[PDB]
Coordinates of C-alpha atoms and ligand atoms in Angstrom, one line a residue:
Chain G
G1 CA 65.0 -38.5 151.7
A2 CA 63.0 -38.9 148.9
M3 CA 63.8 -41.5 145.8
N4 CA 64.5 -40.1 142.7
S5 CA 65.9 -40.6 139.0
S6 CA 68.9 -39.0 140.6
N7 CA 69.5 -42.0 143.3
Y8 CA 68.0 -44.4 141.1
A9 CA 71.3 -46.8 140.8
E10 CA 70.7 -47.5 145.0
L11 CA 67.8 -49.6 144.3
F12 CA 70.4 -52.0 143.1
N13 CA 73.4 -52.0 146.1
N14 CA 74.1 -54.7 148.7
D15 CA 71.3 -53.0 151.4
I16 CA 68.8 -55.0 151.6
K17 CA 65.1 -52.4 150.6
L18 CA 61.6 -53.2 149.9
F19 CA 59.1 -51.3 148.3
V20 CA 55.6 -51.0 149.2
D21 CA 52.5 -50.7 147.1
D22 CA 49.3 -50.0 149.1
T23 CA 47.4 -48.7 145.3
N24 CA 45.5 -52.7 145.5
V25 CA 44.7 -53.1 149.3
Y26 CA 41.7 -51.5 149.2
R27 CA 39.4 -52.5 146.1
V28 CA 35.2 -51.6 145.5
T29 CA 32.9 -52.4 142.8
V30 CA 30.5 -49.4 143.0
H31 CA 26.7 -50.1 142.1
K32 CA 23.4 -49.1 142.3
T33 CA 20.8 -49.8 145.2
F34 CA 17.3 -51.3 144.7
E35 CA 16.2 -47.8 145.7
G36 CA 18.6 -46.2 143.3
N37 CA 21.7 -45.3 145.6
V38 CA 25.3 -45.7 145.5
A39 CA 26.9 -48.7 147.4
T40 CA 30.3 -50.3 146.7
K41 CA 31.2 -53.8 147.8
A42 CA 34.5 -54.8 148.9
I43 CA 36.7 -57.2 146.9
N44 CA 40.2 -59.3 147.7
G45 CA 42.9 -56.7 147.4
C46 CA 47.1 -57.3 147.9
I47 CA 49.7 -55.4 149.3
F48 CA 52.5 -54.9 147.1
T49 CA 56.0 -55.8 148.7
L50 CA 59.0 -56.2 146.0
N51 CA 62.6 -56.3 146.9
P52 CA 64.2 -54.6 143.3
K53 CA 67.6 -56.3 143.8
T54 CA 66.5 -59.3 143.7
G55 CA 63.0 -59.7 142.6
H56 CA 61.1 -61.3 145.6
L57 CA 57.7 -59.9 146.0
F58 CA 55.6 -60.4 149.5
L59 CA 52.3 -60.6 148.7
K60 CA 50.2 -60.1 151.2
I61 CA 46.9 -60.9 150.3
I62 CA 43.4 -59.1 152.2
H63 CA 40.8 -60.6 152.4
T64 CA 37.2 -58.8 152.5
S65 CA 36.6 -59.5 156.0
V66 CA 39.3 -57.4 157.3
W67 CA 36.6 -54.7 156.1
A68 CA 33.6 -55.6 158.0
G69 CA 32.6 -53.7 160.3
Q70 CA 34.9 -50.6 160.0
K71 CA 34.6 -47.1 159.4
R72 CA 36.9 -44.9 157.1
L73 CA 38.4 -48.1 155.3
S74 CA 40.9 -45.8 152.4
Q75 CA 41.9 -44.3 155.9
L76 CA 42.1 -48.3 157.4
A77 CA 43.9 -49.2 154.9
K78 CA 46.7 -47.6 155.3
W79 CA 47.2 -48.6 158.5
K80 CA 46.4 -52.4 157.5
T81 CA 49.4 -51.4 155.1
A82 CA 51.4 -50.5 157.3
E83 CA 50.7 -53.0 161.0
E84 CA 51.3 -56.2 157.6
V85 CA 54.1 -54.7 156.3
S86 CA 56.0 -54.1 160.9
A87 CA 54.8 -57.8 160.8
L88 CA 56.8 -59.4 157.7
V89 CA 59.7 -57.6 158.8
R90 CA 59.4 -58.6 162.4
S91 CA 58.6 -62.4 160.7
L92 CA 62.6 -62.0 158.9
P93 CA 65.9 -63.2 160.4
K94 CA 67.2 -59.6 161.2
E95 CA 69.8 -60.2 158.3
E96 CA 67.4 -60.4 156.1
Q97 CA 65.3 -57.2 157.2
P98 CA 65.3 -54.3 155.1
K99 CA 67.7 -51.2 155.6
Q100 CA 65.4 -49.0 154.0
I101 CA 61.5 -49.6 153.2
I102 CA 60.2 -47.1 150.4
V103 CA 56.4 -46.2 150.1
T104 CA 55.5 -45.3 147.2
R105 CA 52.3 -42.6 147.8
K106 CA 53.4 -40.7 150.5
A107 CA 50.3 -41.1 152.6
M108 CA 51.6 -44.4 153.9
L109 CA 54.7 -42.8 155.4
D110 CA 53.0 -41.7 158.9
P111 CA 51.0 -44.9 159.5
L112 CA 54.3 -47.3 158.3
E113 CA 56.7 -44.6 160.6
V114 CA 54.7 -45.3 163.8
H115 CA 54.5 -49.4 162.6
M116 CA 58.1 -49.2 162.6
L117 CA 58.9 -47.1 166.0
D118 CA 60.4 -50.3 167.0
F119 CA 62.9 -50.0 164.5
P120 CA 64.2 -47.5 164.3
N121 CA 67.6 -48.1 162.3
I122 CA 65.3 -49.0 159.3
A123 CA 64.8 -45.7 156.9
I124 CA 60.9 -44.8 155.6
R125 CA 61.2 -43.5 152.9
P126 CA 59.1 -41.6 150.2
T127 CA 59.6 -41.7 146.2
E128 CA 59.4 -39.0 143.3
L129 CA 59.3 -41.2 140.6
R130 CA 55.3 -42.8 139.4
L131 CA 56.2 -46.5 139.3
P132 CA 53.2 -48.7 137.8
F133 CA 53.0 -51.4 140.4
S134 CA 49.2 -50.5 141.0
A135 CA 48.8 -53.1 137.5
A136 CA 50.2 -56.0 139.8
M137 CA 46.4 -57.1 139.3
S138 CA 46.8 -57.2 135.9
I139 CA 49.6 -60.2 136.1
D140 CA 47.4 -63.2 135.8
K141 CA 48.3 -65.3 138.3
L142 CA 48.8 -63.0 141.4
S143 CA 44.9 -61.6 140.4
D144 CA 44.3 -65.2 140.3
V145 CA 45.5 -66.1 143.9
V146 CA 44.3 -62.8 145.2
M147 CA 40.7 -63.4 144.3
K148 CA 40.6 -66.8 144.7
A149 CA 41.4 -66.2 148.3
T150 CA 39.2 -67.8 151.3
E151 CA 41.1 -66.3 154.2
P152 CA 44.3 -63.5 154.8
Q153 CA 47.2 -65.1 153.0
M154 CA 50.4 -64.3 152.4
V155 CA 52.3 -65.5 148.6
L156 CA 55.7 -65.0 147.6
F157 CA 56.3 -64.7 143.8
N158 CA 60.2 -63.8 142.1
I159 CA 58.5 -61.1 140.0
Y160 CA 61.5 -61.2 137.3
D161 CA 61.2 -65.3 136.8
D162 CA 64.7 -66.8 135.9
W163 CA 65.4 -63.2 134.1
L164 CA 68.7 -62.8 136.9
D165 CA 70.2 -65.8 135.0
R166 CA 70.7 -63.7 132.2
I167 CA 70.1 -59.6 133.4
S168 CA 71.5 -57.7 135.4
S169 CA 69.1 -56.6 138.0
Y170 CA 69.0 -52.9 136.8
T171 CA 67.7 -54.2 133.7
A172 CA 65.7 -56.8 135.3
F173 CA 63.4 -54.3 136.9
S174 CA 63.4 -51.6 133.7
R175 CA 62.0 -54.6 131.7
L176 CA 59.5 -54.7 135.1
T177 CA 58.0 -51.5 134.9
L178 CA 57.6 -51.5 131.1
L179 CA 55.6 -54.5 130.9
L180 CA 54.0 -52.5 133.8
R181 CA 53.2 -49.6 133.1
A182 CA 52.2 -51.0 129.5
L183 CA 49.7 -53.1 130.9
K184 CA 48.5 -49.6 133.0
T185 CA 48.0 -47.4 129.7
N186 CA 46.2 -50.4 127.9
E187 CA 46.0 -53.9 129.3
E188 CA 44.0 -55.8 126.3
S189 CA 47.2 -54.4 123.7
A190 CA 49.5 -55.4 126.3
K191 CA 48.7 -58.6 127.2
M192 CA 48.0 -59.4 123.0
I193 CA 51.8 -58.8 122.7
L194 CA 52.5 -60.6 125.9
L195 CA 50.9 -63.8 124.8
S196 CA 50.3 -63.2 120.7
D197 CA 52.5 -65.9 119.5
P198 CA 50.9 -69.2 121.0
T199 CA 54.8 -70.7 120.6
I200 CA 56.0 -69.0 123.9
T201 CA 54.5 -70.4 127.2
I202 CA 54.6 -69.5 130.6
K203 CA 55.8 -71.9 132.9
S204 CA 54.0 -73.6 135.6
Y205 CA 56.5 -71.9 138.0
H206 CA 56.7 -68.2 135.8
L207 CA 54.5 -65.7 136.0
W208 CA 56.0 -64.0 131.7
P209 CA 56.4 -66.0 129.2
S210 CA 59.7 -67.6 128.4
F211 CA 61.1 -65.1 125.9
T212 CA 64.9 -65.7 124.5
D213 CA 66.7 -62.7 125.0
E214 CA 66.2 -61.7 121.3
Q215 CA 62.6 -62.1 121.8
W216 CA 62.9 -60.0 124.8
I217 CA 64.0 -56.9 122.6
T218 CA 61.0 -57.2 119.9
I219 CA 58.7 -57.3 123.2
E220 CA 60.1 -54.8 124.5
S221 CA 60.2 -52.5 121.7
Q222 CA 56.0 -53.3 121.1
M223 CA 55.6 -52.2 124.7
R224 CA 57.5 -48.9 123.6
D225 CA 55.2 -48.7 120.5
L226 CA 52.1 -49.4 122.8
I227 CA 53.0 -46.4 125.1
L228 CA 54.0 -43.9 122.7
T229 CA 50.6 -44.7 121.1
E230 CA 48.3 -44.8 123.8
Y231 CA 50.0 -41.5 124.9
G232 CA 48.9 -40.4 121.2
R233 CA 45.3 -41.7 121.3
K234 CA 45.0 -40.1 124.8
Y235 CA 46.8 -36.7 123.9
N236 CA 46.4 -36.8 120.3
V237 CA 49.8 -36.7 118.7
Chain N
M1 CA 54.1 -4.1 197.1
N2 CA 57.3 -5.2 197.0
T3 CA 60.6 -3.6 194.8
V4 CA 63.8 -4.3 192.4
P5 CA 66.3 -1.8 193.4
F6 CA 68.7 -1.2 190.7
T7 CA 72.7 -0.1 191.5
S8 CA 72.7 2.3 188.1
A9 CA 72.6 1.6 184.6
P10 CA 75.6 2.1 183.0
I11 CA 74.0 1.1 179.2
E12 CA 71.3 2.8 177.5
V13 CA 68.4 -0.8 177.5
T14 CA 65.2 -1.1 177.2
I15 CA 63.8 -2.6 180.2
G16 CA 60.7 -5.3 180.3
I17 CA 58.4 -6.1 183.4
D18 CA 56.3 -8.4 182.4
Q19 CA 53.8 -6.7 179.6
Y20 CA 55.0 -3.5 179.9
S21 CA 58.7 -1.8 178.7
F22 CA 60.5 1.2 178.6
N23 CA 63.7 2.8 177.5
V24 CA 66.3 3.9 180.2
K25 CA 69.3 6.0 178.7
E26 CA 73.4 5.0 179.1
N27 CA 74.3 6.5 182.0
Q28 CA 70.7 8.2 182.8
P29 CA 69.8 8.0 186.7
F30 CA 67.4 5.1 187.2
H31 CA 67.2 2.7 190.4
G32 CA 65.1 0.5 189.1
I33 CA 61.1 -0.8 189.8
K34 CA 58.4 -0.3 192.5
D35 CA 55.3 -1.3 193.4
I36 CA 55.3 -5.0 192.2
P37 CA 52.5 -6.9 192.5
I38 CA 52.9 -8.9 195.2
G39 CA 51.6 -12.9 194.7
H40 CA 52.3 -13.2 191.1
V41 CA 55.9 -14.6 189.7
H42 CA 57.3 -12.1 187.2
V43 CA 59.9 -11.6 184.7
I44 CA 62.5 -8.7 184.0
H45 CA 64.1 -8.5 180.7
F46 CA 66.5 -6.2 179.0
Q47 CA 67.4 -5.7 175.1
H48 CA 70.6 -3.5 175.0
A49 CA 70.0 -0.4 173.0
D50 CA 73.4 -1.1 171.1
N51 CA 72.8 -5.2 170.5
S52 CA 69.4 -6.1 169.9
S53 CA 70.4 -9.4 169.8
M54 CA 69.7 -11.5 172.7
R55 CA 66.8 -10.4 174.8
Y56 CA 67.4 -12.2 178.3
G57 CA 65.8 -11.7 181.2
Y58 CA 64.7 -13.2 185.1
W59 CA 62.2 -15.0 186.4
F60 CA 61.3 -14.5 190.3
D61 CA 59.1 -14.6 193.0
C62 CA 59.3 -11.9 195.4
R63 CA 58.0 -14.1 197.9
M64 CA 61.1 -16.1 197.5
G65 CA 63.7 -13.2 198.6
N66 CA 65.2 -9.5 198.3
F67 CA 66.5 -9.3 195.4
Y68 CA 68.5 -6.0 193.1
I69 CA 69.8 -6.2 189.2
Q70 CA 73.7 -5.1 188.7
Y71 CA 75.3 -4.4 185.7
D72 CA 78.9 -6.8 185.2
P73 CA 81.1 -4.7 182.8
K74 CA 83.3 -8.4 182.0
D75 CA 79.8 -10.3 181.6
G76 CA 78.5 -7.1 179.5
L77 CA 74.9 -7.6 181.3
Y78 CA 72.4 -6.6 183.6
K79 CA 72.3 -9.7 186.3
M80 CA 70.0 -10.3 189.3
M81 CA 72.0 -10.9 192.5
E82 CA 69.9 -11.5 195.6
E83 CA 71.0 -9.7 198.9
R84 CA 70.6 -11.8 202.1
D85 CA 71.0 -8.6 204.6
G86 CA 67.3 -7.6 204.9
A87 CA 68.2 -4.6 206.6
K88 CA 70.7 -3.5 204.3
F89 CA 67.9 -4.1 201.3
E90 CA 65.3 -1.7 203.0
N91 CA 68.1 1.0 203.8
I92 CA 68.3 0.7 200.1
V93 CA 65.2 0.6 198.5
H94 CA 63.4 3.4 200.8
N95 CA 66.6 5.7 200.1
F96 CA 65.8 5.4 196.2
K97 CA 62.4 5.8 196.6
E98 CA 62.9 9.4 199.0
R99 CA 64.4 10.1 195.8
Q100 CA 62.3 9.3 193.5
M101 CA 64.4 7.5 191.1
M102 CA 62.2 4.4 190.8
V103 CA 59.7 3.6 187.6
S104 CA 55.7 2.3 188.9
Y105 CA 55.2 -1.2 187.7
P106 CA 52.1 0.7 186.0
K107 CA 48.9 -2.0 187.3
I108 CA 45.9 -0.2 185.5
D109 CA 43.2 -1.8 188.5
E110 CA 40.5 -3.4 185.5
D111 CA 43.4 -5.1 184.7
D112 CA 43.7 -8.3 185.0
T113 CA 46.5 -9.5 181.9
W114 CA 49.4 -10.7 183.8
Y115 CA 47.2 -12.9 186.8
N116 CA 45.6 -14.1 183.7
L117 CA 48.7 -15.4 181.5
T118 CA 50.9 -15.8 184.4
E119 CA 47.6 -18.3 186.2
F120 CA 49.4 -21.9 186.9
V121 CA 53.0 -20.7 186.3
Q122 CA 55.1 -21.8 189.5
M123 CA 58.6 -20.0 190.1
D124 CA 59.5 -23.6 192.6
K125 CA 58.8 -25.8 188.9
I126 CA 60.3 -23.9 186.9
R127 CA 63.6 -23.6 188.6
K128 CA 63.4 -27.2 187.5
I129 CA 63.3 -26.4 183.8
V130 CA 66.1 -23.9 184.1
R131 CA 68.4 -25.4 186.2
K132 CA 70.6 -23.7 189.1
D133 CA 70.3 -24.0 192.1
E134 CA 72.0 -21.7 193.3
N135 CA 69.8 -19.4 192.9
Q136 CA 65.9 -18.6 193.6
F137 CA 65.1 -16.7 190.5
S138 CA 66.0 -18.3 186.6
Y139 CA 67.6 -16.8 183.5
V140 CA 66.3 -17.6 179.9
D141 CA 67.8 -16.2 176.8
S142 CA 66.8 -15.7 173.2
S143 CA 69.1 -18.0 172.1
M144 CA 69.0 -21.2 175.1
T145 CA 67.8 -24.6 173.1
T146 CA 65.4 -27.1 174.8
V147 CA 66.5 -30.6 176.0
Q148 CA 64.6 -32.0 172.8
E149 CA 66.6 -29.4 170.6
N150 CA 69.6 -30.8 171.8
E151 CA 68.9 -34.5 171.0
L152 CA 67.7 -33.2 167.1
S153 CA 75.1 -28.5 172.9
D154 CA 75.4 -27.3 176.5
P155 CA 72.9 -29.0 178.9
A156 CA 73.4 -26.5 181.6
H157 CA 71.9 -23.7 179.6
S158 CA 69.2 -25.7 178.4
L159 CA 65.5 -25.0 179.1
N160 CA 64.4 -28.8 180.4
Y161 CA 60.7 -28.4 179.1
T162 CA 58.5 -32.1 179.0
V163 CA 59.7 -33.7 176.0
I164 CA 56.5 -34.7 173.7
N165 CA 56.5 -36.8 170.6
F166 CA 54.1 -37.9 168.7
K167 CA 56.0 -40.5 167.0
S168 CA 57.3 -42.2 170.2
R169 CA 57.3 -45.2 171.2
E170 CA 55.8 -42.9 174.8
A171 CA 53.3 -41.4 172.5
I172 CA 52.0 -45.1 170.9
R173 CA 50.5 -48.0 172.4
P174 CA 52.2 -51.2 170.9
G175 CA 49.1 -52.6 169.1
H176 CA 47.0 -49.1 169.3
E177 CA 49.1 -47.8 166.9
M178 CA 46.5 -46.4 164.1
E179 CA 43.8 -45.6 166.9
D180 CA 46.9 -43.7 169.4
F181 CA 48.5 -41.5 166.8
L182 CA 44.9 -40.6 165.5
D183 CA 43.4 -39.5 168.9
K184 CA 45.9 -38.8 171.2
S185 CA 43.8 -39.1 174.6
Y186 CA 46.2 -41.9 176.0
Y187 CA 49.4 -39.6 175.2
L188 CA 47.3 -36.9 177.1
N189 CA 45.4 -38.5 179.9
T190 CA 47.7 -41.3 181.2
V191 CA 50.8 -40.7 179.9
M192 CA 51.5 -37.1 180.4
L193 CA 48.6 -36.5 182.8
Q194 CA 48.5 -38.7 185.3
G195 CA 51.6 -39.8 185.6
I196 CA 54.1 -37.1 184.6
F197 CA 52.9 -33.3 185.1
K198 CA 50.3 -35.0 187.8
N199 CA 47.6 -33.1 187.6
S200 CA 46.3 -30.1 184.5
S201 CA 47.4 -27.0 186.9
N202 CA 51.4 -28.3 185.9
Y203 CA 50.2 -28.9 182.3
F204 CA 48.8 -25.9 181.7
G205 CA 51.6 -23.7 183.6
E206 CA 54.7 -25.2 181.0
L207 CA 52.3 -24.5 178.7
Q208 CA 52.1 -21.0 179.9
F209 CA 55.6 -20.7 180.8
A210 CA 56.7 -22.6 177.0
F211 CA 54.8 -19.0 175.4
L212 CA 56.0 -16.7 177.9
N213 CA 59.8 -17.4 176.5
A214 CA 58.4 -17.2 172.9
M215 CA 57.2 -14.2 173.3
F216 CA 59.4 -12.2 175.5
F217 CA 63.1 -13.6 174.0
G218 CA 62.0 -14.9 170.8
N219 CA 63.1 -18.5 172.2
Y220 CA 62.8 -21.2 169.1
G221 CA 62.4 -23.7 170.9
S222 CA 59.6 -22.5 173.6
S223 CA 57.2 -21.6 170.9
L224 CA 57.6 -25.1 169.2
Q225 CA 57.0 -26.6 173.0
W226 CA 54.2 -24.0 173.7
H227 CA 52.3 -25.6 170.1
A228 CA 53.8 -28.9 170.9
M229 CA 51.4 -28.8 174.0
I230 CA 48.1 -27.1 172.2
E231 CA 48.0 -29.7 169.8
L232 CA 48.0 -32.8 171.9
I233 CA 45.4 -31.2 173.8
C234 CA 43.5 -30.4 170.1
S235 CA 44.4 -33.6 168.9
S236 CA 42.7 -36.2 171.9
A237 CA 39.1 -36.6 171.4
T238 CA 38.7 -37.2 175.1
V239 CA 39.8 -34.0 177.3
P240 CA 38.0 -33.5 180.7
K241 CA 35.9 -30.8 180.2
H242 CA 37.2 -28.2 182.6
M243 CA 40.0 -28.4 181.1
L244 CA 39.5 -27.6 177.9
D245 CA 36.9 -24.0 178.6
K246 CA 40.5 -23.2 180.9
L247 CA 42.6 -24.1 177.5
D248 CA 40.1 -21.6 175.6
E249 CA 40.8 -18.7 178.6
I250 CA 44.1 -19.0 178.1
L251 CA 45.2 -18.9 174.6
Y252 CA 42.2 -17.0 174.5
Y253 CA 44.9 -13.9 176.6
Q254 CA 47.7 -15.5 175.0
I255 CA 46.8 -14.3 171.5
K256 CA 45.0 -10.9 172.9
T257 CA 49.1 -9.6 174.4
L258 CA 50.8 -11.2 171.7
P259 CA 52.3 -8.3 168.9
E260 CA 50.4 -7.9 166.6
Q261 CA 53.4 -7.8 164.1
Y262 CA 55.1 -10.8 165.6
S263 CA 52.7 -13.2 164.1
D264 CA 54.1 -14.2 161.3
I265 CA 57.1 -16.0 163.4
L266 CA 55.3 -16.3 166.7
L267 CA 52.4 -18.9 165.1
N268 CA 52.5 -21.7 163.4
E269 CA 49.6 -21.8 160.6
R270 CA 49.5 -25.6 160.7
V271 CA 48.3 -26.2 164.6
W272 CA 46.8 -23.5 165.1
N273 CA 44.2 -24.7 161.3
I274 CA 44.8 -28.1 162.7
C275 CA 43.4 -26.8 166.5
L276 CA 40.9 -24.9 164.6
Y277 CA 39.4 -25.8 161.9
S278 CA 40.1 -29.7 161.8
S279 CA 40.8 -31.3 165.3
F280 CA 38.3 -32.8 167.7
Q281 CA 38.7 -29.7 169.7
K282 CA 37.4 -27.6 166.8
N283 CA 34.2 -26.4 168.1
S284 CA 35.7 -26.1 172.3
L285 CA 37.5 -23.1 171.4
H286 CA 34.8 -20.5 171.2
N287 CA 37.1 -17.2 172.9
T288 CA 40.1 -18.2 170.8
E289 CA 38.3 -18.9 167.4
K290 CA 36.9 -15.5 167.6
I291 CA 39.9 -13.6 168.4
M292 CA 41.8 -15.7 166.3
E293 CA 39.7 -14.6 163.5
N294 CA 39.8 -10.7 163.6
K295 CA 43.0 -10.5 164.8
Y296 CA 44.8 -12.8 162.4
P297 CA 42.5 -14.0 159.8
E298 CA 45.4 -14.2 157.6
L299 CA 46.6 -17.0 159.3
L300 CA 43.9 -18.9 158.6
Ligands
W00_401 N1 58.0 -34.3 187.2 C1 58.3 -32.5 186.3 O1 58.1 -32.3 187.6 C2 57.6 -32.2 186.1 S1 56.2 -32.0 185.7 C3 56.2 -30.2 184.8 C4 56.2 -29.4 185.2 O2 55.1 -29.0 186.3 N2 55.6 -28.0 184.5 C5 56.0 -26.1 185.2 C6 57.1 -25.7 184.3 C7 56.3 -24.3 184.5 C8 55.6 -24.2 184.9 F1 55.8 -22.5 186.0 C9 54.9 -24.6 186.1 C10 54.9 -26.0 185.5

């Protein structure tokens, strides 16, 4: 069934699984028309499909052309998501296909279930966790490839950089969700934290700065401060 | 007119005949039901006074033979049997009529209820759903499961209803996933109507046959089947105009006939609200929507 705080370590066992997040698939700006009406203009989007054990991120870029001439785009976006995840599974060798796919929003369950009827053994599951993957577009290098795309495109990343050389995937996921939760609550402060010290750089083949173990403890504590704070500034406490 | 005689009534029982019902006391001198309209299927059903558990009964058509009821004290129920000796059967029936030990099928002459509930039900087609080829009549009871319920355990005692599943490869054409799931016309018209039922008469017949099993025996899988068959039509954008008009009439009489006090369990809130207010056919079921709103506005 659903995924929650009680079966949390299942994410790091040896059964291949993928999270799918569709919150950045259909993206728009809203603006006024010359006549003083409101209209939307879509911008490029992305499906965020992540192996939480290995860090492999399958970033499928959703080019605005896929919306041209279409109606009910927010509903289509869920089915376009399910179509692309199905295509990805089919493209993988059998021993690499996931045994479970966990959607971050329950609205994706039926679209994905229907697109995956051919895989009756792949479990499609929801989750009670409030994961912060919507903040993926606050990672500069992911935002850059999405915005520059002129056609549909899949790009592969490791969202954990080289962290698994030093820490476990349980800890790597905890760090990732803490970074992303911070970027979501206050993007400016979050980024200021990550990049303040100009002597810690991001390697060309990485997404995050090359922090030492000790520097990560400092970073992590600063991100928790930010999240409690904003939660005060938000809730006045 | 035809007659279903009873050898006797050794146990206290409520007897149903179509939408009518009457109480028979233990060892009361009851020898059957007369004046049954020829030309319609019929169902004769039973609920023991001592065990309201297990409603059970027999679908039959008088044109297909001389049938009677006889209590079996080993198996503990009223059984339908066929008498092959025609002279023996007229002789028995005539003697019981002369002594006036039979109840009369009590049809008001204005009343088309039973016809309206059974328009497309067929006895030969029914024999395929409740498989028992050695008898011309068919037994059903409250506990019998459906083939799809068995997929989700005795197949000889199962209700072989047409299996409808909206998230199945049968329902969904590769490459039309979103289209076919949101507009089920392909599944309704090509898969089900053209290529399995063969025509809408067979489709309405099973839908009619499902409902009656749900109402008269509280058979849960039948209720599931009735609602599924409604939902498939309601969730199709492209339905023949004549089918919509007939469906409205079919459902209207089913809703009219349902016991007011069984609504909580025989009606699925989600399917009905979908069908009457959200679906493609929300504005196509005028009679059904009107009786539903005036009789069960709580469900909506
Ligand atoms: N391929 C087949 O033979 C199944 S075609 C379904 C069908 O004819 N169902 C039906 C069930 C009960 C009725 F009273 C009337 C019709």
